DNA sequence: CGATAACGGTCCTAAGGTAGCGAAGC
DNA sequence: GCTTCGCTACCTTAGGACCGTTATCG
């Protein structure tokens, strides 16, 4: 239990580079959340319809699914379109972390760069991302969530679908279908670095 | 839904402000309810044994146990110790806040001051935060929260009974327990507006 | 006469949300 | 050759977590 600007060891910081880089090998997720108990000496959780519920409400509150576009030169037009779920947390916090990763039985918890001590769980893999994240929010966050993160929820949805008839390789799928999406769903169109301004200058772009 | 970067417009404040200004008057909470209910366009709500752990969650993340010690003049040692739940959550989001509120049976909602569309619901009349937030906390919230927002609940509840017992107008138990549990708490030492720099300098203006 | 309820104001990083690049793969 | 994986760096604001007074009330 780490206070107020105080940072995480480097030693640790190694060893979570380590056992990610271990899994990724073995694919063995079994040992993965063996080896992250032991570091962050977290207790166990059984996984009830319970604790699932608690999880629910807590992504209402603290975990994103959302769409990035950036330039890919070798990409089949000059641009990618990059769906995300993501769940940060400062350490002190990683046992609830570590109860989404039990429960969608995926993800990989990372330091989040610049932070003292902030923690973040992804899940970026298409598949995962339709079989365990989002049969989850329509199963347990649906029901009790906003208008805004429901809509969230379809248009994902809506993108992963359109991926598996493989709209990202056409063009009139693509720019009308795909790229909508991608721009209704920013929070920080806007921002410095962002691939793109707007919806046309990325559809003006797939061009 | 408003857009990032969209203020809550001023016909909505003005009339949450009224609303407030209704309860205050009347002490009518179920009317409370509905005035929220409609101003917002909120769907009305079944409390259920699953919307409770779904709230568990939501609050593990979005909700903050908190306690302020303050100078005050006119009190028996010159300051007061004051505990407060509060749960913060943007306009879009309202109908997770109403859910608490129709859970707890008691708090206010208002806009947070200086923000875009952020609400905050508080409660920090002492026999609710006994009576309703505490239990529910533990009934619900611990078992699955993080060692640390487990050991805040332990001490709120501590400064709670304290302040039944009366140990803040007994200089000895003001600085010798109540002043080292709010201590212990605290996560913004060192913020510009703090109202003690470290526990010494608030036990040395106590005596 | 006080305590404390009541409620606004303030601070400011841990949370949200994005983009880029090498290596690995249908 | 083009898409996807893993990991790292990045940007930006709604959250948390206080503090300051004045109304209320036994
Ligand atoms: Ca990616
Ligand atoms: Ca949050
Ligand atoms: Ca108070």
Do not use: C
């Not at 932070?115 to 009790?144: C, G, H, M, W």
Request: hydrophobic share 40%; proline share 3%; no cysteine.
């Amino acid at each position: 239990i780490l206070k107020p600007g105080e940072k995480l060891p480097q030693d640790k910081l190694e060893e979570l580079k380590k056992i990610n880089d271990a899994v990724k090998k073995t694919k063995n997720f079994s040992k993965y959340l063996i080896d992250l108990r032991k570091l962050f000496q977290i207790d166990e959780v059984q996984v009830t319809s319970e604790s699932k519920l608690f999880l629910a409400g807590f992504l209402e509150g603290e975990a994103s699914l959302n769409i990035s576009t950036k330039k890919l030169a070798t990409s089949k037009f000059g641009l990618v379109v990059d769906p995300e779920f993501n769940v940060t947390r400062h350490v002190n916090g990683v046992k609830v972390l570590y109860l989404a990763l039990e429960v969608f039985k995926t993800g990989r918890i990372r330091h989040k760069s610049g932070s003292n001590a902030t923690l973040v769980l992804t899940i970026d893999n298409r598949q995962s991302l339709e079989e365990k994240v989002i049969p989850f929010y329509e199963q347990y966050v649906v029901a009790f969530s906003s208008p805004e993160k429901v809509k969230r929820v379809a248009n994902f949805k809506a993108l992963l679908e359109l991926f598996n008839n493989d709209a990202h390789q056409d063009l009139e799928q693509l720019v009308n279908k795909i790229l909508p999406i991608w721009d209704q769903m920013r929070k920080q169109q806007g921002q410095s670095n962002e691939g793109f301004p707007n919806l046309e200058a990325a559809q003006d772009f797939a061009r």
